[PDB]
Design a protein that fits this description.
GFP-related; Green Fluorescent Protein; Green_fluorescent_prot; Green fluorescent protein; luminescence; eleven-stranded mixed beta barrel; mainly beta; photoprotein; 11 strands
Length: about 220
């Protein structure tokens, strides 16, 4: 909570497996919650990424959302720290397979760490995902609605991501998310609100490995 008043270093580690095609992603960057901003460089450490980068954006630290002063009491993400939280999602790609993910987001020393496992199943081998037919593209801007889940002492959200297909359509990725604290210390359970997200992608022209530069700008609102 007081842990996020300056610039905090980030490590991200993902182990994945989609229809038996395995991969790893290693990331580093910085979060600055005062300005609701995140900067990440993400590298596929196993060579070629077998899914499109934009399908992993949401998976690859909502504790860096700017909650304005008048809504600080509704910030579940920071309040669970330093022990952290588990973030789980299922992502259903319309007419194709799904991902399930489990992440732990917590401090390890001074570094905020997001460690993730992802399993994907029932993908078509020449679908939009395993066939790499999605444009390289984040989303700016859109809202994600957060609600308390009092029974699990956490939060929930569901939202749609729209991936542009090379030909001209859209591939829908329907997200269902739950977050639960890792510790047993008291957490802030929020009233209904939303996060406004602007995400943008780039490439580092000096990096030869398969990678993504991810920038996010996030502000809470709605109370």
């Amino acid at each position: 909570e007081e842990l996020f008043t300056g610039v905090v270093p980030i490590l991200v580690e993902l182990d994945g497996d989609v229809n038996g095609h395995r991969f790893s992603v290693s990331g580093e960057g910085e979060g600055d919650a005062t300005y609701g901003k995140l900067t990440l460089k993400l590298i596929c450490t196993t060579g070629k990424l077998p899914v499109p980068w934009p399908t992993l954006v949401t998976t690859l630290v909502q504790c860096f959302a700017r909650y304005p002063d008048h809504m600080k009491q509704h910030d579940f993400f920071k309040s669970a720290m330093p022990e952290g939280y588990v973030q789980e999602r299922t992502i259903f790609f319309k007419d194709d397979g799904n991902y399930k993910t489990r992440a732990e987001v917590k401090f390890e020393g001074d570094t905020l760490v997001n460690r993730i496992e992802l399993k994907g199943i029932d993908f078509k081998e020449d679908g939009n995902i395993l066939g790499h037919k999605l444009e390289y593209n984040g989303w700016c801007a859109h809202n994600i609605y957060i609600t308390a889940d009092k029974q699990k002492n956490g939060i929930k959200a569901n939202f749609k991501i729209r991936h542009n297909i090379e030909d001209g359509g859209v591939q829908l990725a329907d997200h269902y998310q739950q977050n639960t604290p890792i510790g047993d210390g008291p957490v802030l359970l929020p009233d209904n609100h939303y996060l406004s997200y602007c995400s943008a992608l780039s490439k580092d022209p000096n990096e030869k490995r398969d990678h993504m530069v991810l920038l996010e700008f996030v502000t809470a609102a709605g109370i």
